[PDB]
Design a protein around this ligand. Structure first.
Ligand SMILES: [O-][O-]
Ligand SMILES: [Cu+2]
Ligand SMILES: [Cu+2]
Ligand SMILES: [Cu+2]
Ligand SMILES: [Cu+2]
Lengths: 544, 528
């Protein structure tokens, strides 16, 4: 039978339960924690031929590009480009992923019920079923201060203590299914047709998902499980201009600034908000922010030229669209992207596929996700209008359940406001590029104000770095970066002059790509364009 | 009981088998017939899963060294010898104990898992296997590194093929070590809140549940292991890892007596480069000892772990691989200093100390007695060897191949300067950054001395030596030829500077003292 995606079934006793912040949810805890851990462990341990195994569910998103729920799987097109179900660089990006997250949530809920049926004693039946019915997939608030932004506590824990129903007072420390996804062998040697086999990282050599764990110049057996370098990921997540590392300047995490802007800027239409797909004012979009977070969580650079004692590179699944869904944090990230969509919808209530560009895609089938159309009595694919109201999938968020503008400021606008207040003008960077510029491989666009260090053009530790744009998806693509504070620093160092944005396109070997076109400009409001960007050159040894 | 320690029994098919470099061995084993690798993985797994009342469980064998300070083998401060001249010999017997237990567990594994017609092949491999050593001072297969196998969470083994958790990656118990059953509970750093050993995994500003298993930050460990002067960070200067230089010097410098070579104990200065001091820094570099740092930092390079901590270091499986190489360095030095064995007025006293709790049978009396140092002067009597000492005629050239005006830093300190707590003495040439006085990334950093401890015997202090030739050469070039006055900072586990700690630091040149060290002030928020 087709798998009909409904969201968790509606119980009068459980009216629109909320998806909680995963750090809040964990800190308060332990039946729901036990349920989620036990259910997800079962799901991750299902066989490859079980379509509701974790592997096959993550598989929907990308590699290994197989069928799912009876829907033919993908393949490389005539361009040489892998074709799968997930939508990137198009206006259905938020709605495709809305249904995807709901699928995952529903499968977990059903495994929770099966866990209760097999493991909980009569005394505890109804309480445990009650918690299953109130549970919803937690979100990771990547833009909320945990002083700094952080990966969820639970994601950084290799083991988690759970309850043992029937043995009161007894708890067990179990492998945490949110920490990593581990298979029984290297993903490159799975049974056909499931092997993860173009990609520029050795994901065929991984048994487990990893964050920053893949580096060139280590034994290939290290890549089987490169570990969870969550401290490194937290560092990347707190990216900000380089000058803010100097004494006497305050910092603001660029991710939080971007998210505050995304949620509070008015006058965007759906097409502008929903996607990177292409007034530079309106280029700050959901998908661009989501792309940078993918990069910062997983890492995308496998190597770096030269010799470096401190090694800040390292690659991992979340930066790679074909395999990102295997990392258990993928779903928590997309749960928050769904939350951000709901928030924006709530404060932009008429802007639903409302422009001439996105209207073309409004009625796209969101394959492979089935539902029953009661009006025609047929099994059909989800469409974006079916999930316009996320509440018809029987979940909500606290923030979307009157005080939403205040809550946005309180969660994402306090630091920005505090530091900006020290300086009444805004500056932004516009960035436009082609996701195909490097034959489909990912790349990072880094922008600098002032001289670029030809051996160090990578991150917030690089002299004069201002911000990055990550080409996750591998028509054009756009993004936007805050630039106000970095321009102020530059003006201070350079007699008030406005800086020329300088950019470098960095590939997964940490080298600069000279023929990837990027259009970068600096804009000002008391927006007008005030400087045109230029490519910076790097050292000979660092040139692709 | 008693458990008689003998080394692996002699087998005429296996004359004096060598303890191999663990990276070479792992590549031999994987580079399909991985029988020795399977044997070591499976046997150490079984040993790690033995119960606490089994004195041959991993926990109890590690417990000999320090916490939780219980009996072992009927023998009622840990047993481990530190800051004394029996440091190399006590640990020689300890490593042999570990190796023999694993071998016996290998035989058990074969009896349990190998079909009858395969047993001879598998037994042949067990009998050839010896505990591999970690060559912490050899460039790994550009830089020094933790062993390949220590950095792998999972390892593929034969089923007499299958991926299994790697018992060399961590030691994991089923509960937090603070809650174990009396008397075994591990109850400074929150080691009671650990279920697993960790490298750099304990940081203060994170949820305590993170500490249950702080992970294996092996990239950070590798960075520490490659410690060298800050200036070698700059374009386009060449770098030399201090650990490799120290090791080359330890092995090639003639004229030390056993007392000088064997220990940090100080009851001149050119002779303060000793085995125990190098071993101490490696402990720090593998595990990390700083739990916190004051002030605002984007890049967080601190974090603490078991290997930096005397009472719990033996729980980390790399402990044994590190001590295997310390034993190899002893054997190399013995080979090139053959007349120097507890043979000076200082160390002679300690030679007949019983190496408790380790039992052996005396053939002269047919009694069970304790090991003494002279019983293991010849390590081959324990039926193992090292390639480098089995072929001794070339030893000088191999040492050079592997690890190879002079200026040296001398450092004399009390292990109990902070009441027994660990600390790191960092030395600088030039101005010190009052908010960054910690490592190779800190401006003008030259090198560190780690106090591996956790009051000192009257009249007893500790010494170490650091290479300084390249660092002085740089500072003079950059500073109008000025010979640098060494500046020191004594750093505690909170990343703050301990000003009420007196250390004796001095710069010597070919040796004559040419400069006296001074304590560097740091920012107020960074002062202990
Ligand atoms: O979007 O993954
Ligand atoms: Cu996606
Ligand atoms: Cu995504
Ligand atoms: Cu010891
Ligand atoms: Cu030691």
């Amino acid at each position: 039978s087709p798998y009909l995606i409904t969201g968790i079934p509606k119980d009068p006793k459980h009216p629109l339960p909320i998806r909680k912040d995963i750090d809040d949810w964990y800190l308060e805890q332990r039946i729901q924690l036990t349920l989620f851990v036990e259910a997800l462990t079962v799901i991750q341990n299902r066989p490859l031929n079980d379509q509701l195994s974790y592997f096959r569910l993550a598989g929907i998103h990308g590699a290994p590009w197989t069928e799912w729920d009876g829907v033919p799987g993908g393949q490389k097109d005539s361009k040489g480009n892998p074709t799968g179900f997930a939508v990137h660089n198009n206006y259905t990006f938020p709605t495709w992923h809305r249904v995807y997250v709901t699928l995952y949530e529903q499968v977990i809920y059903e495994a929770m019920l099966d866990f209760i049926k097999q493991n909980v004693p009569q005394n505890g039946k109804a309480d445990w079923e009650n918690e299953a019915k109130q549970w919803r997939l937690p979100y990771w608030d990547f833009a909320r201060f945990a002083d700094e932004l952080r990966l969820p506590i639970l994601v950084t824990m290799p083991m988690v203590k759970v309850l043992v129903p029937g043995q009161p007072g007894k708890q067990l420390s179990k492998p945490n299914p949110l920490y990593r996804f581990q298979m029984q062998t290297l993903m490159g040697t799975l049974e056909r047709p499931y092997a993860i086999t173009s990609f520029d990282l050795p994901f065929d050599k991984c048994q487990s998902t990893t964050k920053y764990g893949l580096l060139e110049n280590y034994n290939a057996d290290v890549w089987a499980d490169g570990g969870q370098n969550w401290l490194r990921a937290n560092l990347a997540l707190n990216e900000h201009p380089w000058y803010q590392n100097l004494d006497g300047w305050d910092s603001v995490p660029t991710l939080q600034d971007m998210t505050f802007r995304l949620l509070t800027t008015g006058g965007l239409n759906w097409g502008e908000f929903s996607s990177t797909r292409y007034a530079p004012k309106n280029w700050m979009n959901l998908e661009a922010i989501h792309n940078n977070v993918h990069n910062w969580v997983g890492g995308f650079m496998f190597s770096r030229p030269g010799r470096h004692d401190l090694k800040l590179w390292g690659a991992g699944h979340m930066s790679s669209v074909p395999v990102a869904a295997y990392d258990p944090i993928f779903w928590l990230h997309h749960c928050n992207i769904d939350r951000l969509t709901a928030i924006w919808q709530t404060v932009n209530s008429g802007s639903w596929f409302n422009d001439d560009k996105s209207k073309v895609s409004k009625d796209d089938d969101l394959r492979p996700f089935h539902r029953f159309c009661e009006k025609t009595r047929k099994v059909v694919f989800f469409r974006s209008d079916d999930v316009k109201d996320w509440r018809s999938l029987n979940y909500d968020y606290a923030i979307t359940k009157s005080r939403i503008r205040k809550e946005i400021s309180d969660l994402y606008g306090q630091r920005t406001k505090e530091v900006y207040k020290d300086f009444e003008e805004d500056y932004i960077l516009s960035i436009r590029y082609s996701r195909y510029a490097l034959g489909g491989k990912p790349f990072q666009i880094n922008i600098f104000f002032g001289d670029v260090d030809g051996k160090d053009f990578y991150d917030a530790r690089s002299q004069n770095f201002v911000g990055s744009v990550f080409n996750f998806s591998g028509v054009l693509s756009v993004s936007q970066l805050p630039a106000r504070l970095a321009v102020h620093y530059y003006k201070k160092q350079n007699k008030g002059e406005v800086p020329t944005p300088r950019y470098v396109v960095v590939n997964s070997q940490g080298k600069a790509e000279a023929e990837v076109k990027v259009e970068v400009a600096l804009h000002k409001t008391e927006y007008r364009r005030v400087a045109d960007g230029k490519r910076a050159e790097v050292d000979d040894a660092y040139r692709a």
